[PDB]
Amino acid sequence: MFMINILMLIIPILLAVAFLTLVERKVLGYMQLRKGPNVVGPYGLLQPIADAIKLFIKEPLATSSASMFILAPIMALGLALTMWIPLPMPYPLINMNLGVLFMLAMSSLAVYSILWSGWASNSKYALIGALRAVAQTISYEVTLAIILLSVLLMSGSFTLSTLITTQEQMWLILPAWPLAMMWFISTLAETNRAPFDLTEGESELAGPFALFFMAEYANIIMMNIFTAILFLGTSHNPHMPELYTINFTIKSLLLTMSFLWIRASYPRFRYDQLMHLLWKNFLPLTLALCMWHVSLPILTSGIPPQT
Amino acid sequence: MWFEVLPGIAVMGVCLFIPGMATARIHRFSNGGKEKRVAHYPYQWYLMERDRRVSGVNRSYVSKGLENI
Amino acid sequence: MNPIIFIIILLTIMLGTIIVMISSHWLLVWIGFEMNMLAIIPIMMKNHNPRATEASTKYFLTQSTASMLLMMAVIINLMFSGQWTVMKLFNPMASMLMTMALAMKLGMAPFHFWVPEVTQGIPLSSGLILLTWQKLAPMSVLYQIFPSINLNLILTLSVLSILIGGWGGLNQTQLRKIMAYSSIAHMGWMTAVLPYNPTMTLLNLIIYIIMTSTMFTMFMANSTTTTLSLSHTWNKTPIMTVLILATLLSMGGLPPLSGFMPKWMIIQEMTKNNSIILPTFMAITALLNLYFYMRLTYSTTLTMFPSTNNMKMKWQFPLMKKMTFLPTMVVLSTMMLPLTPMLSVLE
Amino acid sequence: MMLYIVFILSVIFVMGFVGFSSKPSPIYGGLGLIVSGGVGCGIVLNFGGSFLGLMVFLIYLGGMMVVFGYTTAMATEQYPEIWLSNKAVLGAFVTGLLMEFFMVYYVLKDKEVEVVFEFNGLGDWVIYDTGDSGFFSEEAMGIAALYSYGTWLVIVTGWSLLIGVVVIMEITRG
Amino acid sequence: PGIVELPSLEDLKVQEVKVSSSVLKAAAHHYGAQCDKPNKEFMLCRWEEKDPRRCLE
Amino acid sequence: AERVAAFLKNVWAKEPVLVASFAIAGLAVILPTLSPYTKYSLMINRATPYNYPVPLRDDGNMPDVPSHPQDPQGPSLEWLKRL
Amino acid sequence: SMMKWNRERRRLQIEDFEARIALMPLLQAEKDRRVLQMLRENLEEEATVMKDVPGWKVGESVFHTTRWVTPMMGELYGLRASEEVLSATYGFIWYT
Amino acid sequence: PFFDVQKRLGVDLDRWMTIQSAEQPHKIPSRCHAFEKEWIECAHGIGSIRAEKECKIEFEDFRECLLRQKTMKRLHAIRRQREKLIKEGKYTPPP
Amino acid sequence: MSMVYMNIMMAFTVSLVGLLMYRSHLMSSLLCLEGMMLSLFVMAALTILNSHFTLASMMPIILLVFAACEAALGLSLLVMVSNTYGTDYVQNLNLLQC
Amino acid sequence: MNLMLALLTNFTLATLLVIIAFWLPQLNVYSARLPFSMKFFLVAITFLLFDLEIALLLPLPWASQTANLNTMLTMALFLIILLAVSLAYEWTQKGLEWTE
Ligand SMILES: CCCCCCCCCCCCO[C@@H]1O[C@H](CO)[C@@H](O[C@H]2O[C@H](CO)[C@@H](O)[C@H](O)[C@H]2O)[C@H](O)[C@H]1O
Ligand SMILES: CCCCCCCCCCCCO[C@@H]1O[C@H](CO)[C@@H](O[C@H]2O[C@H](CO)[C@@H](O)[C@H](O)[C@H]2O)[C@H](O)[C@H]1O
Ligand SMILES: CCCCCCCCCCCCO[C@@H]1O[C@H](CO)[C@@H](O[C@H]2O[C@H](CO)[C@@H](O)[C@H](O)[C@H]2O)[C@H](O)[C@H]1O
Ligand SMILES: CCCCCCCCCCCCO[C@@H]1O[C@H](CO)[C@@H](O[C@H]2O[C@H](CO)[C@@H](O)[C@H](O)[C@H]2O)[C@H](O)[C@H]1O
Ligand SMILES: N=C(N)NC(=N)NCCc1ccc(I)c(Cl)c1
């Protein structure tokens, strides 16, 4: 029974990633006064399938270390799917008492796939590009962890389903919209999304490729699902759980679509400029707001329950 | 037109609806039609293990009421 | 270094030591060593050269290894007693590991190899801290765990240090290496008496620190790091040569000078315990140190070495180094023997 | 059997240690330490150390070991030497691997063993606590107490981290 | 060292409350009000004797 | 004072992010001491019964100790209900 | 709004915790008998199994004190089936 | 401590975590709390030289609770004997 | 002792022997130093958790924090060595022989 | 068991996808220092030191449940302020600059 449940999560995640590539292309297209894919299947609905087949029968074009060349994509894709197993939608696949910490711990491991693939590139210049990407990723891990802790001081625990209870009456975006703003931007920078897509930017100044792409786009969906739960909590009715799933899916779709919207709207940061955005802007505010959110429940007598 | 973007969004939305809807219905099927019991702390695990013994069939989700008194 | 940062780093070195000395919990003792080691590395590196980087790295590896062994002893002690109180350990394997860890930190033979190399590679002021202040924290732990220390292990460490320290100094012309090997020998006296009377350990430690500080301060006043450089002192600061002579004879343990006192009292305590062969062997072996102290006095004060013409330019300028506490330290280093009974304050 | 899960994890723990302790290329040594870190978390998890187990992942693996690999790629090795191609590494790896297997064989055969010291071999489950029905995590209560009982621990720890920043900036300025 | 004294299997027998935890949770608040006295007498015994064998009655 | 206001306008123009950070951090340090509600945080935390309330052996000289949970003696949470 | 809801959540936690406190004497009474029954059952089998071991005294304490000592896991489930032991040892840690 | 500043000032810097029978959050007791308490109370104020000999019974009991070596050894004996008899078919275990 | 302590104690010994038997890379010896910490963290956590020493639950975290800070210092020394010679080889750190 | 199954499924699937991704029918018959930059090293180290302070703050949601709130709030703010001081020191010592 449990193995069926795992597959009813793994398979839809990969299908959702496939069709996000179509949605991204069509949303970007219409914001650019054009259409995007509309020939390969009606309204382009077969475009992800054609792309997927094409990439997997392409020539799989020497690695500096075979073990790490293969480890990096397995790590990326395996970790990406793992981040989904504690998500309450409304019931998690695995109900963890410390689910928020688990997601923080697993996400911190994702930078190894960047590091390992840079080592296996066998090229001095690709290793340097990987190290620049790693420095960006760990920099924005700092604010994400501190922002998350600030929010949990209103929730009371590290259990993800408690965020639902915390937002029974009101979305956490209202008491914490300054944190929501930096959290949202931090996720963009964390996933190397525009205007923080410096790996693809700086770089230009088959199956293995597809696998890394699936991992990244799964992370994009997951981060926006996490954002919906963290700040736009949906109400759970235990006798009609599908009502929660519909409302929570719509919010996650809209948050994901706003990632595309933002890509279509702005130029790119310089590397040093996105480092200053973190170390000189977000981190000072995040630290001050962390002190504020430690004090606020105490001074209002609004400390949440431990359980 | 922009509403030709919807079919791809609909497929994506149905793909993301399946995990949550499947988990909830699998939980009811496996737990006698009720929510799966949450036991994050030793006290809740102790009650669940006592429920298993009291059930008479080794299922913590099979409940005995005043009929057993 | 920024002067304010240098002060804060010096205070952190002191704070780490103080934490070790006031702690009743083994974790806080370990933290004190960690904090102390973190703050001392920047003053080993401050002159930025390959020799100072090698010394800082050799020092880091030794102290980090010793701190890991210390934490092992603490955790083994917790497993077999269920408590963290700083006192006798409750497991002989834990006692050996902590004794070995503290011997490594003090640079006792045969864990001594780093002391001459690290001292040579760092500035005089940093060597002054390394060979004096840094002995305080490990010795204060040994002061509290000595009931559970293996007697054979500690006395073997002491005897080896007195031999290695004495022999190692015979081959040295670098003043920092002479002080390093001198330090190793003096540590052996401190630990040899610890099983019998820890008070005498404190007496030896305090007096050693005073004479060691005096010598380093006098080397710093003249910027002398080699024997031959020190041999030019007579033709610049004749008073300094006399002070160096008196202090070296004191570190040699010659009566009627202060440095006789710790050797005198250690021999007494060991004989009260029917230890006769060991104190006699130690006293005779300490003649090795006297030999290479006397060698320095010959080239510094009791003979006049050749000079250089440019030295005349130095005659026209005064000493501007701080020489802080030097007049007090030199008088304590040489003239304290008549006050020996004052050691009871350390009881 | 799953009743020996902690022991099985501990066996894997040792093999990972023999991995990097024989010191292949630091790229592979770093990999061996990461696998041992994950397995070490699993051992801690099975003793009720949920928060402690996840700190190894978050801090030891996601923080310290990431910085180790970052530094290795930048200042030590950029291309790993083929694993076990060196004779001493292969000999040290084989020597440690055989010692572990001989330990594991005997403890499982006799349900005890004396490797210098006496170790029981019935399974670590036997020493576990038999009564637990509190409404909280004891590990969480103990860790949370850092802010009520451990004022002095917070002060010295926080101070040391600030000095860590100051010291490292001094070291590297050169 | 001596022998751990244990009560016989018969001295432990009693009629069980074989209802599930949701039944107990539902009745808990009235149960605490109604059965307070024998319950508190038992808990005093346990915390004073520190021995389950001494509070079987 | 006027020099204080001129300094604040300058930083507000050039570094509004840092000005906001310091203002928020200052409020976090100060407001708990000025808030009339901070005292209830102490009381609510203490009123949460994590472990069992072990009863006292009645020696006949405890008029302030309730005999039954529903007796009047003992702490009341009526202040918490109205909160 | 967050202050009001969290205050209500604290009142709801207290009510939940007081339900546990009401039931704790009953659960404690059951836990005592279950533990003693298991120990007594382990004692019957020891008398049979260690009947002809020279010097063995059945049910002898390993502690000098006569104070009651809480048994560890191997003392209660020492001779029981592996499935029950696994649930008693790792069931809570492994639960979802 | 080498310098007992804590006692001189009355400040508790680290004594609170030195033993497991000290005060704990929510009165959560350690498994060997009663054994540690007995040993500490036996040895209090007489000095470690005397306590090593006179509180040996309390300390041996406490060490048994800590590491459970004798208990595990006894269980090893009973299990080993039971396997022998079952291997010889002389014993059938009850349900 | 319990069976797990055998392997955890063995792991520390393996890493200690690894640390004391240097090869060439200074980084390799730093990894053994952090392996020693890891085995210490696990052994301390197991003892503290099993004994239900509640307040000691924070100790492994403190050990982890301080040991990570020590490792950061060690890594800084390694890069300074690497900047001087172009490698982290310990055979280059032999100037203080004389 | 469930979490172990989930992890094994996720990574086992990832391995399989990599497998077929590398082997499909083709139909054909015929250790120096990497141009070391000190600034990127200091970013990693700074991340590490801030990550260790975050480790110390993670317990805060549980710590707020204490009755010793006076001590707990003072220590929580003290830790965060010291984190801010660390950032302020790095900032004013040009540790956050990418020029030169
Ligand atoms: C997602 C599931 C998809 C299932 C689809 C199953 C279809 C299986 C049949 C695949 C046929 C692929 O067809 C073949 O692919 C390889 C990909 O390198 C191409 O390339 C191959 O041939 C050329 C020469 O022609 C070689 O130089 C090259 O090294 C080799 O890779 C071929 O030019 C193409 O003819
Ligand atoms: C080098 C740094 C220089 C700065 C030195 C600063 C030292 C600060 C010392 C802090 C500890 C002060 O002293 C200690 O404080 C805390 C409250 O604050 C008290 O602790 C109190 O709260 C906890 C919770 O139960 C328990 O420790 C105890 O129950 C209670 O006494 C201690 O009883 C008191 O002894
Ligand atoms: C330098 C090596 C560095 C790696 C260290 C590796 C970890 C070492 C683990 C040590 C833990 C075992 O420590 C050892 O355990 C046994 C178990 O009873 C103790 O007991 C043993 O000696 C005493 C002697 O009176 C008695 O208990 C008994 O004869 C015997 O069992 C030892 O007194 C203790 O020294
Ligand atoms: C660089 C070092 C920086 C260190 C920064 C430390 C800043 C600390 C600022 C606030 C510290 C005290 O903050 C707050 O003050 C008020 C003063 O009435 C205390 O008092 C309040 O709560 C207590 C409960 O304990 C009530 O009994 C009291 O009636 C109530 O007024 C709070 O308990 C405390 O939470
Ligand atoms: N970036 C875009 N949105 N367009 C785009 N060309 N994406 C990449 C195409 C792609 C990659 C993997 C898979 I599986 C699929 Cl189905 C499609």
Side-chain angles (χ1 to χ4, degrees), chain A residues 18 21 24-25 48 51-52 55 210 213-214 217 263:
Chain A
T21 71
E24 167 163 50
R25 282 167 77 168
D51 290 334
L55 284 161
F213 185 96
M214 305 168 150
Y217 267 51
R263 187 205 235 202

PDB file of all heavy atoms in Angstrom, chain A residues 18 21 24-25 48 51-52 55 210 213-214 217 263, ligand 5:
ATOM      1  N   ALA A  18       7.441  17.868 -16.505  1.00  0.00           N
ATOM      2  CA  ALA A  18       7.413  17.840 -17.961  1.00  0.00           C
ATOM      3  C   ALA A  18       6.527  18.948 -18.513  1.00  0.00           C
ATOM      4  O   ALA A  18       6.927  19.681 -19.422  1.00  0.00           O
ATOM      5  CB  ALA A  18       6.925  16.478 -18.448  1.00  0.00           C
ATOM      6  N   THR A  21       7.547  22.779 -18.367  1.00  0.00           N
ATOM      7  CA  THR A  21       8.352  23.292 -19.467  1.00  0.00           C
ATOM      8  C   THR A  21       7.468  23.853 -20.571  1.00  0.00           C
ATOM      9  O   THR A  21       7.816  24.853 -21.202  1.00  0.00           O
ATOM     10  CB  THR A  21       9.267  22.196 -20.016  1.00  0.00           C
ATOM     11  OG1 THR A  21       8.491  21.216 -20.710  1.00  0.00           O
ATOM     12  CG2 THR A  21      10.039  21.524 -18.899  1.00  0.00           C
ATOM     13  N   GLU A  24       5.850  27.124 -19.059  1.00  0.00           N
ATOM     14  CA  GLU A  24       6.838  28.195 -19.054  1.00  0.00           C
ATOM     15  C   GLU A  24       7.003  28.789 -20.445  1.00  0.00           C
ATOM     16  O   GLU A  24       7.009  30.010 -20.612  1.00  0.00           O
ATOM     17  CB  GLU A  24       8.178  27.679 -18.538  1.00  0.00           C
ATOM     18  CG  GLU A  24       9.319  28.637 -18.791  1.00  0.00           C
ATOM     19  CD  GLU A  24      10.532  28.350 -17.944  1.00  0.00           C
ATOM     20  OE1 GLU A  24      10.974  27.186 -17.912  1.00  0.00           O
ATOM     21  OE2 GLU A  24      11.051  29.290 -17.314  1.00  0.00           O
ATOM     22  N   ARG A  25       7.128  27.937 -21.456  1.00  0.00           N
ATOM     23  CA  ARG A  25       7.351  28.430 -22.805  1.00  0.00           C
ATOM     24  C   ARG A  25       6.152  29.215 -23.313  1.00  0.00           C
ATOM     25  O   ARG A  25       6.314  30.219 -24.011  1.00  0.00           O
ATOM     26  CB  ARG A  25       7.671  27.264 -23.734  1.00  0.00           C
ATOM     27  CG  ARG A  25       9.091  26.770 -23.593  1.00  0.00           C
ATOM     28  CD  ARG A  25       9.295  25.443 -24.274  1.00  0.00           C
ATOM     29  NE  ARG A  25       9.406  25.586 -25.716  1.00  0.00           N
ATOM     30  CZ  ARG A  25       9.819  24.626 -26.532  1.00  0.00           C
ATOM     31  NH1 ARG A  25      10.172  23.447 -26.052  1.00  0.00           N
ATOM     32  NH2 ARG A  25       9.882  24.853 -27.832  1.00  0.00           N
ATOM     33  N   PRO A  48       6.183  18.464 -24.524  1.00  0.00           N
ATOM     34  CA  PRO A  48       7.077  17.850 -23.531  1.00  0.00           C
ATOM     35  C   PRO A  48       7.431  16.411 -23.852  1.00  0.00           C
ATOM     36  O   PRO A  48       8.543  15.971 -23.541  1.00  0.00           O
ATOM     37  CB  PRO A  48       6.280  17.961 -22.224  1.00  0.00           C
ATOM     38  CG  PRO A  48       5.220  18.964 -22.493  1.00  0.00           C
ATOM     39  CD  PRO A  48       4.896  18.849 -23.927  1.00  0.00           C
ATOM     40  N   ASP A  51      10.045  16.496 -26.703  1.00  0.00           N
ATOM     41  CA  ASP A  51      11.324  16.905 -26.137  1.00  0.00           C
ATOM     42  C   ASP A  51      11.938  15.782 -25.316  1.00  0.00           C
ATOM     43  O   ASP A  51      13.140  15.523 -25.412  1.00  0.00           O
ATOM     44  CB  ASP A  51      11.148  18.154 -25.273  1.00  0.00           C
ATOM     45  CG  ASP A  51      10.833  19.396 -26.084  1.00  0.00           C
ATOM     46  OD1 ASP A  51      11.201  19.458 -27.273  1.00  0.00           O
ATOM     47  OD2 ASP A  51      10.217  20.324 -25.525  1.00  0.00           O
ATOM     48  N   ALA A  52      11.126  15.101 -24.507  1.00  0.00           N
ATOM     49  CA  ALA A  52      11.649  14.047 -23.644  1.00  0.00           C
ATOM     50  C   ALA A  52      12.208  12.892 -24.459  1.00  0.00           C
ATOM     51  O   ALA A  52      13.309  12.406 -24.186  1.00  0.00           O
ATOM     52  CB  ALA A  52      10.556  13.553 -22.699  1.00  0.00           C
ATOM     53  N   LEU A  55      15.526  13.990 -26.299  1.00  0.00           N
ATOM     54  CA  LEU A  55      16.712  14.075 -25.462  1.00  0.00           C
ATOM     55  C   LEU A  55      17.249  12.700 -25.104  1.00  0.00           C
ATOM     56  O   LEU A  55      18.464  12.525 -24.982  1.00  0.00           O
ATOM     57  CB  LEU A  55      16.399  14.865 -24.193  1.00  0.00           C
ATOM     58  CG  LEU A  55      16.309  16.380 -24.369  1.00  0.00           C
ATOM     59  CD1 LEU A  55      15.568  17.007 -23.209  1.00  0.00           C
ATOM     60  CD2 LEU A  55      17.680  16.988 -24.511  1.00  0.00           C
ATOM     61  N   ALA A 210      18.920  15.939 -19.314  1.00  0.00           N
ATOM     62  CA  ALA A 210      17.514  15.945 -18.939  1.00  0.00           C
ATOM     63  C   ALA A 210      17.344  15.685 -17.450  1.00  0.00           C
ATOM     64  O   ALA A 210      16.490  16.295 -16.802  1.00  0.00           O
ATOM     65  CB  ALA A 210      16.757  14.904 -19.757  1.00  0.00           C
ATOM     66  N   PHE A 213      17.933  18.709 -15.435  1.00  0.00           N
ATOM     67  CA  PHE A 213      16.833  19.632 -15.669  1.00  0.00           C
ATOM     68  C   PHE A 213      15.598  19.235 -14.871  1.00  0.00           C
ATOM     69  O   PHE A 213      14.942  20.091 -14.273  1.00  0.00           O
ATOM     70  CB  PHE A 213      16.516  19.689 -17.159  1.00  0.00           C
ATOM     71  CG  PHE A 213      15.479  20.700 -17.513  1.00  0.00           C
ATOM     72  CD1 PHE A 213      15.843  21.956 -17.945  1.00  0.00           C
ATOM     73  CD2 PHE A 213      14.134  20.395 -17.419  1.00  0.00           C
ATOM     74  CE1 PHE A 213      14.893  22.886 -18.274  1.00  0.00           C
ATOM     75  CE2 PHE A 213      13.185  21.321 -17.744  1.00  0.00           C
ATOM     76  CZ  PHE A 213      13.563  22.567 -18.172  1.00  0.00           C
ATOM     77  N   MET A 214      15.265  17.945 -14.849  1.00  0.00           N
ATOM     78  CA  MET A 214      14.121  17.497 -14.062  1.00  0.00           C
ATOM     79  C   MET A 214      14.315  17.801 -12.586  1.00  0.00           C
ATOM     80  O   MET A 214      13.374  18.217 -11.906  1.00  0.00           O
ATOM     81  CB  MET A 214      13.881  16.001 -14.258  1.00  0.00           C
ATOM     82  CG  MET A 214      13.710  15.567 -15.693  1.00  0.00           C
ATOM     83  SD  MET A 214      13.772  13.777 -15.882  1.00  0.00           S
ATOM     84  CE  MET A 214      12.698  13.552 -17.294  1.00  0.00           C
ATOM     85  N   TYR A 217      13.711  21.570 -11.998  1.00  0.00           N
ATOM     86  CA  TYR A 217      12.324  21.993 -12.138  1.00  0.00           C
ATOM     87  C   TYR A 217      11.429  21.351 -11.092  1.00  0.00           C
ATOM     88  O   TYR A 217      10.402  21.929 -10.729  1.00  0.00           O
ATOM     89  CB  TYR A 217      11.821  21.694 -13.546  1.00  0.00           C
ATOM     90  CG  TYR A 217      11.997  22.866 -14.474  1.00  0.00           C
ATOM     91  CD1 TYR A 217      13.219  23.502 -14.584  1.00  0.00           C
ATOM     92  CD2 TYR A 217      10.943  23.349 -15.226  1.00  0.00           C
ATOM     93  CE1 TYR A 217      13.390  24.575 -15.413  1.00  0.00           C
ATOM     94  CE2 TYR A 217      11.105  24.427 -16.065  1.00  0.00           C
ATOM     95  CZ  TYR A 217      12.331  25.037 -16.154  1.00  0.00           C
ATOM     96  OH  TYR A 217      12.507  26.114 -16.989  1.00  0.00           O
ATOM     97  N   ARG A 263      10.934  35.883 -14.560  1.00  0.00           N
ATOM     98  CA  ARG A 263      11.955  35.651 -15.575  1.00  0.00           C
ATOM     99  C   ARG A 263      11.727  36.538 -16.790  1.00  0.00           C
ATOM    100  O   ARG A 263      12.683  37.038 -17.392  1.00  0.00           O
ATOM    101  CB  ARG A 263      11.957  34.185 -15.988  1.00  0.00           C
ATOM    102  CG  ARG A 263      13.092  33.807 -16.921  1.00  0.00           C
ATOM    103  CD  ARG A 263      12.746  32.605 -17.754  1.00  0.00           C
ATOM    104  NE  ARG A 263      13.735  31.545 -17.628  1.00  0.00           N
ATOM    105  CZ  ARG A 263      13.914  30.579 -18.523  1.00  0.00           C
ATOM    106  NH1 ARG A 263      13.177  30.533 -19.621  1.00  0.00           N
ATOM    107  NH2 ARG A 263      14.837  29.652 -18.316  1.00  0.00           N
TER     108      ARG A 263
HETATM  109  N1  LIG K   5      13.147  26.022 -20.416  1.00  0.00           N
HETATM  110  C1  LIG K   5      12.016  25.604 -21.079  1.00  0.00           C
HETATM  111  N2  LIG K   5      10.870  25.867 -20.372  1.00  0.00           N
HETATM  112  N3  LIG K   5      11.966  25.026 -22.252  1.00  0.00           N
HETATM  113  C2  LIG K   5      12.820  23.977 -22.526  1.00  0.00           C
HETATM  114  N4  LIG K   5      13.366  23.873 -23.786  1.00  0.00           N
HETATM  115  N5  LIG K   5      13.003  23.192 -21.519  1.00  0.00           N
HETATM  116  C3  LIG K   5      13.883  22.050 -21.689  1.00  0.00           C
HETATM  117  C4  LIG K   5      13.135  20.971 -22.459  1.00  0.00           C
HETATM  118  C5  LIG K   5      12.862  19.702 -21.696  1.00  0.00           C
HETATM  119  C6  LIG K   5      13.839  19.119 -20.908  1.00  0.00           C
HETATM  120  C7  LIG K   5      13.555  17.940 -20.219  1.00  0.00           C
HETATM  121  C8  LIG K   5      12.298  17.356 -20.340  1.00  0.00           C
HETATM  122  I1  LIG K   5      11.835  15.584 -19.327  1.00  0.00           I
HETATM  123  C9  LIG K   5      11.331  17.954 -21.144  1.00  0.00           C
HETATM  124 CL1  LIG K   5       9.779  17.234 -21.294  1.00  0.00          CL
HETATM  125  C10 LIG K   5      11.615  19.128 -21.826  1.00  0.00           C
END
